[PDB]
Design a protein around this motif. Structure first.
Motif, PDB file in Angstrom:
ATOM      1  N   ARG A 145      -9.593  21.237   7.791  1.00 22.42           N
ATOM      2  CA  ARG A 145      -8.411  21.283   8.646  1.00 22.42           C
ATOM      3  C   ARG A 145      -7.556  20.015   8.662  1.00 22.42           C
ATOM      4  O   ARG A 145      -6.332  20.106   8.656  1.00 22.42           O
ATOM      5  CB  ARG A 145      -8.844  21.620  10.066  1.00 22.42           C
ATOM      6  N   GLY A 146      -8.193  18.847   8.703  1.00 23.97           N
ATOM      7  CA  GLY A 146      -7.467  17.589   8.671  1.00 23.97           C
ATOM      8  C   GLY A 146      -6.821  17.332   7.321  1.00 23.97           C
ATOM      9  O   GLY A 146      -7.269  17.855   6.302  1.00 23.97           O
ATOM     10  N   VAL A 147      -5.771  16.517   7.317  1.00 23.42           N
ATOM     11  CA  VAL A 147      -5.015  16.220   6.102  1.00 23.42           C
ATOM     12  C   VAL A 147      -5.578  14.979   5.398  1.00 23.42           C
ATOM     13  O   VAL A 147      -5.914  13.995   6.061  1.00 23.42           O
ATOM     14  CB  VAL A 147      -3.517  16.005   6.427  1.00 23.42           C
ATOM     15  CG1 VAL A 147      -2.646  16.410   5.246  1.00 23.42           C
ATOM     16  CG2 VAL A 147      -3.126  16.808   7.669  1.00 23.42           C
ATOM     17  N   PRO A 148      -5.698  15.031   4.056  1.00 20.68           N
ATOM     18  CA  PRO A 148      -6.133  13.870   3.264  1.00 20.68           C
ATOM     19  C   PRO A 148      -5.323  12.610   3.565  1.00 20.68           C
ATOM     20  O   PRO A 148      -4.108  12.685   3.736  1.00 20.68           O
ATOM     21  CB  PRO A 148      -5.904  14.325   1.820  1.00 20.68           C
ATOM     22  CG  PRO A 148      -6.038  15.799   1.874  1.00 20.68           C
ATOM     23  CD  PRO A 148      -5.520  16.232   3.219  1.00 20.68           C
ATOM     24  N   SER A 192       0.816  -1.210   0.000  1.00 21.49           N
ATOM     25  CA  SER A 192       0.000   0.000   0.000  1.00 21.49           C
ATOM     26  C   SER A 192       0.852   1.264   0.000  1.00 21.49           C
ATOM     27  O   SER A 192       2.035   1.249   0.379  1.00 21.49           O
ATOM     28  CB  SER A 192      -0.941   0.001   1.211  1.00 21.49           C
ATOM     29  OG  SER A 192      -1.876  -1.060   1.113  1.00 21.49           O
ATOM     30  N   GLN A 193       0.236   2.357  -0.430  1.00 26.69           N
ATOM     31  CA  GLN A 193       0.883   3.660  -0.429  1.00 26.69           C
ATOM     32  C   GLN A 193      -0.151   4.689   0.005  1.00 26.69           C
ATOM     33  O   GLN A 193      -1.296   4.657  -0.455  1.00 26.69           O
ATOM     34  CB  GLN A 193       1.458   3.989  -1.816  1.00 26.69           C
ATOM     35  CG  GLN A 193       2.029   5.410  -1.975  1.00 26.69           C
ATOM     36  CD  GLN A 193       3.393   5.589  -1.308  1.00 26.69           C
ATOM     37  OE1 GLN A 193       4.243   4.696  -1.349  1.00 26.69           O
ATOM     38  NE2 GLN A 193       3.595   6.745  -0.671  1.00 26.69           N
ATOM     39  N   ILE A 194       0.237   5.578   0.911  1.00 27.15           N
ATOM     40  CA  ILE A 194      -0.669   6.635   1.334  1.00 27.15           C
ATOM     41  C   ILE A 194      -0.406   7.873   0.499  1.00 27.15           C
ATOM     42  O   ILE A 194       0.743   8.250   0.274  1.00 27.15           O
ATOM     43  CB  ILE A 194      -0.505   6.995   2.822  1.00 27.15           C
ATOM     44  CG1 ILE A 194      -0.795   5.786   3.711  1.00 27.15           C
ATOM     45  CG2 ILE A 194      -1.406   8.180   3.189  1.00 27.15           C
ATOM     46  CD1 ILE A 194      -2.249   5.428   3.796  1.00 27.15           C
ATOM     47  N   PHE A 195      -1.482   8.495   0.037  1.00 23.81           N
ATOM     48  CA  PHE A 195      -1.408   9.772  -0.640  1.00 23.81           C
ATOM     49  C   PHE A 195      -2.146  10.810   0.211  1.00 23.81           C
ATOM     50  O   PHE A 195      -3.300  10.596   0.624  1.00 23.81           O
ATOM     51  CB  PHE A 195      -1.992   9.656  -2.046  1.00 23.81           C
ATOM     52  CG  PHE A 195      -1.250   8.680  -2.919  1.00 23.81           C
ATOM     53  CD1 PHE A 195      -0.173   9.097  -3.686  1.00 23.81           C
ATOM     54  CD2 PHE A 195      -1.615   7.342  -2.956  1.00 23.81           C
ATOM     55  CE1 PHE A 195       0.525   8.195  -4.484  1.00 23.81           C
ATOM     56  CE2 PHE A 195      -0.930   6.437  -3.754  1.00 23.81           C
ATOM     57  CZ  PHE A 195       0.142   6.864  -4.516  1.00 23.81           C
ATOM     58  N   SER A 196      -1.456  11.910   0.508  1.00 21.46           N
ATOM     59  CA  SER A 196      -1.992  12.947   1.386  1.00 21.46           C
ATOM     60  C   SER A 196      -2.032  14.306   0.686  1.00 21.46           C
ATOM     61  O   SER A 196      -2.242  15.341   1.323  1.00 21.46           O
ATOM     62  CB  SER A 196      -1.164  13.038   2.675  1.00 21.46           C
ATOM     63  OG  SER A 196       0.196  13.349   2.401  1.00 21.46           O
TER      64      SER A 196
END
Ligand SMILES: Nc1ncnc2c1ncn2[C@@H]1O[C@H](COP(=O)(O)OP(=O)(O)OP(=O)(O)O)[C@@H](O)[C@H]1O
Ligand SMILES: Nc1ncnc2c1ncn2[C@@H]1O[C@H](COP(=O)(O)OP(=O)(O)OP(=O)(O)O)[C@@H](O)[C@H]1O
Lengths: 606, 606
Positions: B465-468, B425-429
């Motif tokens: 406010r929170g990050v993707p 898996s890879q997280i994208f933010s």
């Protein structure tokens, strides 16, 4: 106890032979010096007297048809008056002549000499070539072997095969029946519960069927039956007759008087037959076949089948006989194992499959090699020091034995399909000389069968007041071979005396003369191999030097102009010499190699 | 649960295909309606619009070369600009055109119509013929299958093969790599301890090598490597080029422009190539080859080898790669298993044996059928109700997968030879729209490799406010096929959405249209078989009556003069009608049979 060394398993076949060993938990089927894992059962003597065996012998057959010998397995152990012999010799190009009562092969062996060879001696040459093949692979001498015979071989054919082994310098520890060997190949590592296996074995000259039970390394033949003069060579001969007749109709020429033509035709017919196992037609072409004229004809699979249909259909009768003798029906057969190269024929496979209501044969069995494989496993067991897994064999005699006592009873003694070793005794109380004839076969009148031999009880000495009591014992041993012995029961004395067969089997003295003859040729083989090996060494050395000198970035770049000239001169001179001295002796090859070395060394060591 | 019925194992090969089932504790390799246990991977459309598949298609290739299709496995799953496609289509006689950025096969299908088929549809026809073969043998419908692919097939080639199965009306329960299937064939009943097996698989269009460990029904691929455009067809093409050049030099004629000549040459070259696996010379003859002139040339084994020597030698590189990737040396290999028909080539066997320092390959393995055999065993396992014994398979992905994120990092994701199923898996933010390209292959820069696909993350929530936090998962499933999914971690939500590959694979709707098209032809196949079956019935009935009437010691002797005349007349009339109405429909055959019966019965029942 005797060091039996590495024991090899040899399938001694009518048209091909095959040798294997059991090493490192597996069977190696050993390739010969031409890289072939089967070897033609052919021998020849060149015009210069050289004995050829195997591929070389087969390769020069058309150029030397009268002094090339093959299909000796169809003659071995037979007498002159055997109808099978008399039919077969009509189609063999080499001369076969009667000596006392047997067929001997007569050929020119060079030096103006004509030699007559027992069939045992020819087969011993083939066995010697198989032995040489094994020895080459193993890097050591082979003295002991397991040798195969058709299950339906009679007593004399068995004994003659064993004698061939002896003549080839082999102690034959066991004669194994071909279908039994194939069964071992099929079933050695099988773990599928007790099963009935039908082995259908159709090779180049013989046909066997055996029904076995197999269970985790225990193999028992329940019944066997066959035909010792039915196989691929017969199918070839049907086709050859067809094309000789066709050619005579087309050209008016009868080519049968011409051995060279007939053997070219045989070679191409064999290749066509093989093609027809995967094609529906094959072209037969021979350049300058007869009197300058070319041969070009097509053989369809349908025609091949038609020409052989009676022969093909006849293979079903032994299957029915072994099923009846085993008290089994078709559906009781769990696996069908096809072995022998002729089982590649589609019509054969179809006949067998249809007989067994669509049941397909077991897969992954090489029909050319399976017999040698099983023989190699049994040889491995007899070697003692192998990881073969356990192997227990129970085999049977193929023919009913009965006796005819002159002035006594005629009686059946040992029924066909009796497990061997087995024995049966008869008491003779008549006194004087007693003569017993032993017959093999299933006709109800014992003496209507094949005469195995004649045995005379000579010395029954008196027994004042008491009754003459001579016990004669007929024992079939584990090789399937009969020994007749006698003991006086009335005397109490222990000495069982072996009674010799009047029908003139090779004596130990005769066998040893044949051994000595064979050992002369074996010595020639040895010296030839050594000579050729050192010639090859000189050749490779010279050509290697040739390559190094031509390499400008290594040796050729290090050598001075002068030294390079000298090096090239020396190497090319040696190569010239080689090209004109292929027939030089071992000493000369060695000496040329050393001359070249003594030229090259002071130079390359700079 | 689903009733999967009888699951078949199908080896879908470049030049031949083969189908097996596991029943009653054994594998049956199923013969087709012409008695052959392998079927040409050929399809054709006759001038009258009939679809032919298998032997019938191959048989009419030289008479209809533009509308006969073969070697589709060299096109399946590839794009138009693939250098392999562009090279291969130069030597294929049927037209291949670009659409959907892919190669499509264009042929005349009758009624004046030209059709373009996806390679998947062509392979689906071959799979349909294998299915029909199985159903004929089983007496029931087949809905599920295990289908083989080369180990070195990429993602798209795998998916396209599965789609071919779907189009043929098969639920493909498993895609199995060819060497893994061969390993099952070799080792299913082996009880020899843990061993390293090297499977060397050289077929008609592809080459695979895999190293496995096997221990009592547990099979694990350690490393694999191959070449998906190297096999028997390439060797044929080298010979073709040789003889086209030779013919041009000899006659001044360039036959390349003539499809019929070229395909006759191809047929005979294939024949000759096979001959040279057991002979050193083969004659190639074609009557009226070109402009009325005959072709007659000889191909030696040495020349065949020379024409292909670079290709043959290139097969050693993948062996070295799997040995290095497995951390093993040559001597660690316990068995060498050769599969694929091209492993019959002597130079190939020699190269492999020499590579492994004289080690001989495992025996008793049919190179044409072993892959289907293994597939059939795995199908047997998936059937559920079979006595296959235990079977555990662990296979690997053949190619390193890496990703390139536009505006993000480029990185390796899943190394080659990773056991599957596997995921990463890879997280994208970053938010916005994320575009990810996936590449297959071993070059160090990820995007220098083969583009598997492009995947866009469209709906990324910009959370207050929170990050993707979008997690993208790359999973390779048990078929070796990639699925890309995304889920919102920041959301919390568990709904994983599948991201569709922009490099558009066939959609379910497109696939269903292809299925409907296939099903029309299948209905024609069904009706044809029924029609022919009833024609055959009428034929056999009429000729049977003919034979009975001619039997003077039963019916012929029972019948009066009069009734015999009427019988003969009726039967002969029906046979005449049959001879001129081979193309009649089902109800006509039924009606004629009934008429004949109504004539015959009042007579024979007297
Ligand atoms: N493809 C084929 N089609 C037909 N016959 C074949 C084929 N291959 C080999 N044969 C035949 O097989 C025979 C050789 O078989 P093989 O060597 O297994 O038997 P053998 O040991 O010589 O015979 P035997 O056991 O009868 O002494 C030859 O007659 C040969 O022509
Ligand atoms: N005796 C032989 N000598 C040389 N080549 C042969 C021989 N027999 C078969 N072949 C070749 O084997 C190939 C077919 O092999 P097989 O059907 O096992 O592989 P495949 O399943 O068609 O191919 P792939 O697995 O590559 O898709 C053909 O190229 C054929 O010419």
């Amino acid at each position: 106890s005797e060091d039996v060394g590495t024991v090899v398993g040899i399938d001694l076949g009518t048209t091909y032979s095959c040798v294997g060993v059991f090493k490192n938990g597996r069977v190696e089927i050993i390739a010969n010096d031409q890289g072939n894992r089967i070897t033609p059962s052919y021998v020849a003597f060149t015009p210069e007297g050289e004995r050829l065996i195997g591929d070389a012998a087969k390769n020069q057959l058309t150029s030397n048809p009268e002094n090339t010998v093959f299909d000796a397995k169809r003659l071995i152990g037979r007498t002159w008056n055997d109808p099978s012999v008399q039919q077969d010799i009509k189609f063999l190009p080499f001369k076969v002549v009667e000596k006392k009562t047997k067929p001997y092969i007569q050929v020119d062996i060079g030096g103006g000499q004509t030699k007559t060879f027992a069939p045992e001696e020819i087969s011993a040459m083939v066995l010697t070539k198989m032995k040489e093949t094994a020895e080459a692979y193993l890097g050591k001498k082979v003295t002991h072997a397991v040798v195969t015979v058709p299950a339906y071989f009679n007593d004399a054919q068995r004994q003659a095969t064993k004698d061939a082994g002896t003549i080839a310098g082999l102690n034959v520890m066991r004669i194994i029946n071909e279908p039994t060997a194939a069964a071992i190949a099929y079933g050695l590592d099988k773990r599928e519960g007790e099963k009935n296996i039908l082995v259908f074995d159709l090779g180049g000259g013989t046909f066997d069927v055996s029904l076995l039970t197999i269970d985790n390394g225990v193999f028992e033949v329940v019944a066997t039956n066959g035909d010792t003069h039915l196989g691929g060579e017969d199918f070839d001969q049907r086709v050859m007759e067809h094309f000789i007749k066709l050619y005579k109709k087309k050209t008016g020429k009868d080519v049968r008087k011409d051995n060279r033509a007939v053997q070219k035709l045989r070679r191409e017919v064999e290749k066509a037959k093989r093609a027809l196992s995967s094609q529906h037609q094959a072209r037969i072409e021979i350049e300058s076949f007869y009197e300058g004229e070319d041969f070009s004809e097509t053989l369809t699979r349908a025609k091949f089948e038609e020409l052989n249909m009676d022969l093909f259909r006849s293979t079903m009768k032994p299957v029915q006989k072994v099923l009846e003798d085993s008290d089994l029906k078709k559906s009781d057969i769990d696996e069908i194992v096809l072995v022998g190269g002729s089982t590649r024929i589609p019509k054969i496979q179809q006949l067998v499959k249809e007989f067994f209501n669509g049941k397909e044969p077991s897969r992954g069995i090489n029909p050319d090699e399976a017999v040698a494989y099983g023989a190699a496993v049994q040889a491995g067991v007899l070697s003692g020091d192998q990881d073969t897994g356990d192997l227990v064999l129970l085999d049977v005699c193929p023919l009913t034995l009965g006796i005819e006592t002159v002035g006594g009873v005629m009686t059946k003694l040992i029924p066909r399909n009796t497990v061997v070793p087995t024995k049966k005794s008869q008491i003779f109380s008549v006194g004087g000389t007693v003569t017993i004839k032993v017959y093999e076969g299933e006709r109800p009148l014992t003496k209507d069968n094949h005469l195995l031999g004649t045995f005379d009880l000579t010395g029954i000495p008196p027994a004042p007041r008491g009754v003459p009591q001579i016990e004669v014992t007929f024992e079939i041993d584990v090789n399937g071979i009969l020994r007749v012995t006698a003991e006086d029961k009335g005397t109490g004395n222990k000495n069982k005396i072996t009674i010799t067969n009047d029908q003139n089997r090779l004596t130990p003295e005769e066998i040893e003369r044949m051994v000595n003859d064979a050992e002369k040729f074996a010595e020639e083989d040895k010296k030839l191999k050594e000579r050729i090996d050192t010639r090859n060494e000189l050749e490779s050395y010279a050509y290697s030097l040739k390559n190094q000198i031509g390499d400008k970035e290594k040796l050729g770049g290090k050598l001075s102009s002068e030294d390079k000239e000298t090096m090239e001169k020396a190497v090319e001179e040696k190569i010239e010499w080689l090209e004109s001295h292929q027939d030089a002796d071992i000493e000369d090859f060695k000496a040329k190699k050393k001359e070249l070395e003594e030229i090259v060394q002071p130079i390359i060591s700079k």
